[PDB]
Amino acid sequence: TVTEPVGSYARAERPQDFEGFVWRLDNDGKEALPRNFRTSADALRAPEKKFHLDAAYVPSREGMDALHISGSSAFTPAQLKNVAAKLREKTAGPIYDVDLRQESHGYLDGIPVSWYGERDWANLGKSQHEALADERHRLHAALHKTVYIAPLGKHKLPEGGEVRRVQKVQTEQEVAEAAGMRYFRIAATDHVWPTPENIDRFLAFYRTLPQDAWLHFHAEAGVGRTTAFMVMTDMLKNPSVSLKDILYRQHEIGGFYYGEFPIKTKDKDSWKTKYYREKIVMIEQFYRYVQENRADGYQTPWSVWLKSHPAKA
Amino acid sequence: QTVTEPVGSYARAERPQDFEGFVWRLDNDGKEALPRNFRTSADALRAPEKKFHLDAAYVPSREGMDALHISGSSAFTPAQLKNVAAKLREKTAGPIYDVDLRQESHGYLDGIPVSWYGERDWANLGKSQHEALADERHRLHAALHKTVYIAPLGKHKLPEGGEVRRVQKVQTEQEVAEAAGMRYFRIAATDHVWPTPENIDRFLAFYRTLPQDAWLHFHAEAGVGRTTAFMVMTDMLKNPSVSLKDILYRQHEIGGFYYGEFPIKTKDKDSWKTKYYREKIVMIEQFYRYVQENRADGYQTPWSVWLKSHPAKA
Numbered sequence: 001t002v003t004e005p006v007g008s009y010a011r012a013e014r015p016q017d018f019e020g021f022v023w024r025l026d027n028d029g030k031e032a033l034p035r036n037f038r039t040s041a042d043a044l045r046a047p048e049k050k051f052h053l054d055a056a057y058v059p060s061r062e063g064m065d066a067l068h069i070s071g072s073s074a075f076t077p078a079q080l081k082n083v084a085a086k087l088r089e090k091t092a093g094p095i096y097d098v099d100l101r102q103e104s105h106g107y108l109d110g111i112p113v114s115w116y117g118e119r120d121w122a123n124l125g126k127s128q129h130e131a132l133a134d135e136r137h138r139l140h141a142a143l144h145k146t147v148y149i150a151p152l153g154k155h156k157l158p159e160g161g162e163v164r165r166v167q168k169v170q171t172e173q174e175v176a177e178a179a180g181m182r183y184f185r186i187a188a189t190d191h192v193w194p195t196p197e198n199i200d201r202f203l204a205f206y207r208t209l210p211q212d213a214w215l216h217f218h219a220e221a222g223v224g225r226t227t228a229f230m231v232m233t234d235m236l237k238n239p240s241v242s243l244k245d246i247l248y249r250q251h252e253i254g255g256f257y258y259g260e261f262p263i264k265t266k267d268k269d270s271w272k273t274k275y276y277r278e279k280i281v282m283i284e285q286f287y288r289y290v291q292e293n294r295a296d297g298y299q300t301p302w303s304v305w306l307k308s309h310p311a312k313a
Numbered sequence: 314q315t316v317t318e319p320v321g322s323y324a325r326a327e328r329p330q331d332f333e334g335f336v337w338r339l340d341n342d343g344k345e346a347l348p349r350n351f352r353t354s355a356d357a358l359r360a361p362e363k364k365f366h367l368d369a370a371y372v373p374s375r376e377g378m379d380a381l382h383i384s385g386s387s388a389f390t391p392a393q394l395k396n397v398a399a400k401l402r403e404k405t406a407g408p409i410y411d412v413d414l415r416q417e418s419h420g421y422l423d424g425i426p427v428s429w430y431g432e433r434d435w436a437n438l439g440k441s442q443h444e445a446l447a448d449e450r451h452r453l454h455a456a457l458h459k460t461v462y463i464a465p466l467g468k469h470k471l472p473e474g475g476e477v478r479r480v481q482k483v484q485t486e487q488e489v490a491e492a493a494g495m496r497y498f499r500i501a502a503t504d505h506v507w508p509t510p511e512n513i514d515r516f517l518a519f520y521r522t523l524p525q526d527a528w529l530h531f532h533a534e535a536g537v538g539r540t541t542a543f544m545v546m547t548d549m550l551k552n553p554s555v556s557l558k559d560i561l562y563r564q565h566e567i568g569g570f571y572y573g574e575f576p577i578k579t580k581d582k583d584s585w586k587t588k589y590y591r592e593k594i595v596m597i598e599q600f601y602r603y604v605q606e607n608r609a610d611g612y613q614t615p616w617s618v619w620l621k622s623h624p625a626k627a
């Protein structure tokens with residue numbers, strides 16, 4: 001008997017050791033667009049050296065022009081309006097803000113904030129319902145109260161920031177709707193592979209989409225969770241493209257590289273090592289799920305298939 | 314005709330809702346054996362600080378200092394208070410009081426001294442002492458078994474670094490004082506401003522019933538403004554024959570603030586403090602007058618009552 005299967009390593013961590021303690025500033029609002037903004041229509045750039053890839057390899061762009069997805073970090077309401085306008089130039093279909101954040105977040109006086117616990121794991125272990133209830137309660141409790149909002153600096157701890165008495169509170173759903181985007185939430189934990197529940201939820205949602213839907217994915221930084229769902233969408237929509245091409249091209253338009261690479265973390269971040277290894281293994285397993293289940297139209301969900309076809313370290 | 318706020322009460326014009334608490338501030342890092350600015354009335358006088366533009370050649374009278382029996386300091390960890398108590402016990406066989414002058418809610422989380430800090434350290438501004446202590450009791454209790462962020466203030470008087478911990482023990486300063494072998498007395502005085510008539514009436518009633526050999530250890534957060542104000546008050550009350558100049562010079566020269574006139578200079582960001590420094594200078598003078606004019610009948614008239622009939626002038 002195995003306590004936690006591959007793909008579920010985070011279930012072994014204790015939520016009580018990462019409880020939220022500060023309203024973290026998610027974006028300072030200085031730039032017109034959020035960080036790491038990219039779309040599937042973008043030109044491929046040279047790969048980042050840390051992934052030790054072949055800079056001479058040219059991945060297939062088959063299906064990219066029709067993929068219709070984008071990704072970014074968190075944003076201020078003004079930045080999201082800029083994103084929405086930019087994306088409307090590319091499609092006449094519904095544009096979705098696909099919020100991948102498990103952490104409670106929202107807007108206080110229009111400032112994007114999140115209730116941050118160590119490793120951004122303040123809602124670790126909570127069901128999506130419980131995470132969203134926490135978020136609603138916390139945002140409502142901030143109205144007309146004094147809050148401390150701060151960017152994280154040295155040691156991933158607050159440094160500087162501002163103190164204000166809040167006059168307006170909004171959820172991201174409200175901000176997305178104000179920007180003209182549809183909204184869909186998947187509560188995925190920062191830094192780790194999305195859970196079978198997260199992925200089943202995404203696949204059920206994907207199946208409901210009209211042909212011309214545009215998906216704008218984001219979490220906090222626009223790297224791990226954001227690229228994971230962009231990669232899964234590319235695999236689902238372009239199943240004839242090789243795994244190597246999908247991973248190279250999603251990295252080369254500005255995302256994380258989800259293939260094998262020599263992992264090296266700073267000593268203070270050594271806890272991340274096994275989670276990067278787990279993601280590499282799980283990306284391969286998701287590709288296998290798509291290849292094995294697309295012909296019959298996915299009559300068995302990812303969670304069930306993964307239980308009978310466990311991933312191996 | 315009607316004056317909204319008299320001299321001595323300027324802080325009543327400030328709006329409490331603009332300075333609400335937002336972080337557990339680290340009050341002392343615990344690295345030294347004693348709290349900062351620790352001094353006693355038995356100490357030798359040192360040269361005055363240049364910023365006060367005093368006469369370095371002046372030799373203040375030490376009349377009554379040997380029997381004064383008071384000390385002052387900044388906030389402290391429990392270990393530091395035990396070291397203070399041991400040092401004071403070498404100087405007296407009477408009861409030693411921890412006279413906590415802090416209006417801000419504070420206490421100890423896992424033995425770490427913290428305070429609920431709002432801008433200007435005014436998180437309990439405008440509250441009665443009853444309300445301030447109720448806030449403190451509730452906040453300390455609510456921290457038990459919960460995760461808290463404790464941080465020192467750095468650039469811009471805002472949190473910088475610090476630590477995050479799940480609290481396993483909570484204590485009030487009263488508990489910490491009793492564990493150190495000291496009696497405890499609380500006066501909820503607001504940081505940076507002249508103590509209120511309510512604060513001073515409370516102190517005078519307390520002073521009147523003290524045993525002859527009581528030793529009073531005063532402290533607030535830094536061991537400067539409120540700490541020195543009450544040390545000066547006590548010196549004046551106990552040694553009424555000593556001149557105002559001697560009291561102010563000597564309390565400054567053993568390590569306290571200088572409460573007489575001086576060239577007030579503030580950084581632009583601290584310009585709000587200017588009028589409060591001026592107010593403290595005139596109120597120190599007014600308190601000296603109260604002591605001189607009310608000692609003969611044994612202070613039958615409370616300070617608050619006397620001050621309303623003899624208001625200070627700006």
Ligand SMILES: O=P(O)(O)O[C@@H]1[C@H](OP(=O)(O)O)[C@H](OP(=O)(O)O)[C@@H](O)[C@H](OP(=O)(O)O)[C@H]1OP(=O)(O)O
Pocket residue numbers: 119120190191192220221222223224225256269
């Ligand atoms: O962008 P920075 O330099 O800050 O590093 C972030 C992570 O990106 P990577 O280092 O490429 O892994 C990013 O994704 P993960 O790979 O899944 O860890 C992670 O979301 C982001 O953390 P947050 O901003 O808290 O959301 C950065 O990681 P840390 O610096 O470990 O926090």
Ligand SMILES: O=P(O)(O)O[C@@H]1[C@H](OP(=O)(O)O)[C@H](OP(=O)(O)O)[C@@H](O)[C@H](OP(=O)(O)O)[C@H]1OP(=O)(O)O
Pocket residue numbers: 433434504505506534535536537538539570583
């Ligand atoms: O110790 P520093 O140099 O940092 O300044 C403290 C104040 O002392 P002074 O500047 O000497 O006036 C001190 O007393 P006040 O004169 O009554 O203002 C004041 O209590 C202390 O604030 P806290 O540590 O927050 O309690 C310092 O004042 P600020 O620097 O304005 O915060």
Ligand SMILES: [Cl-]
Pocket residue numbers: 126127128129197
């Ligand atoms: Cl769930």
Ligand SMILES: [Cl-]
Pocket residue numbers: 299300301304
């Ligand atoms: Cl099934």
